Amino acid sequence: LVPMVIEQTSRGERSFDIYSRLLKERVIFLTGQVEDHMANLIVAQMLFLEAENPEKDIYLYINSPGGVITAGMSIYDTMQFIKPDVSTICMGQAASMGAFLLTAGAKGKRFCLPNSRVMIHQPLGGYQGQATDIEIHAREILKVKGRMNELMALHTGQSLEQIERDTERDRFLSAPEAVEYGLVDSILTHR
Template identity: 65%
Template structure:
């Protein structure tokens, strides 16, 4: 979880991965229609939050949340999370939108929900926050770097402290744990198994198959 805006440059590997996005062909009375897999999942109200959280990714997630809510605010939205975390402001933009929309947002952790992603995973609709059996959750305090004059370094340090207070208060609210425990447990990297995340109160249950979605 980082305070600073990050500049993410697409590497050759990332560009290669983008070319591997499958295309789904569907038959209809009007003929064939091709979708990329993410657009097809969106038809089923599924949003994939995968990879580092930064502005471009956050804007895409936000747009999908708003679209699905406008389409039908009575039906749940399913947010699948596999992310190492990222920029706090980008994550908070997603968080605020999850609360802004009328539709319940179910969260399902697969793989890892680390740092800012753990906040989002625990911020799904109460009773609808899940993990797959071998998923992990990582909570810790924000990090950031600063350089320049002493005043600038002091300002950056103060912002990190503000961010930590905000994040820990959200984790306390989402989990039901006392803020003192959250402060202690996020001093260092704190890895939780799916069951441990449920016991801690960050999630509500472990999902073993898609039929268990509510």
């Protein structure tokens, strides 16, 4: 159940959902596995906020365990496409896609909570069929792995070679460790 919160305005009081009231304040939530439906929803939230005020920064909270790579690109492309800087805050955890969408935020506006946990790894996949089809899908996921590492290196400022060595296996990072890695900029310990 989502609570309904009241907002006081000169025109009157309008009952808003707790998630919608925050949207009015340029706050987006990226929770749960990243799929195509939630991503298309998050995309729509960005576009709406861009039109409302394309100069105010957007805040996108990330508490996701990771998901489909294709859906994440839709969110990543939209972040870079719009003019406002999309601040990325990591609450609880950020997996491969969540981390990719965490470091993809605006330089100097990527925050993380102290007890949060970041995780980066290589793409996952598979295919069953003839040898010919297997080769095609294999090359595709390989290009994705290379493409993702290029973008990760761009935001973190690290070398592509180092990222490949660190992304070959599941690697966990804490908030301070991430700062040194460049995935995040600062830590939000207190107000």
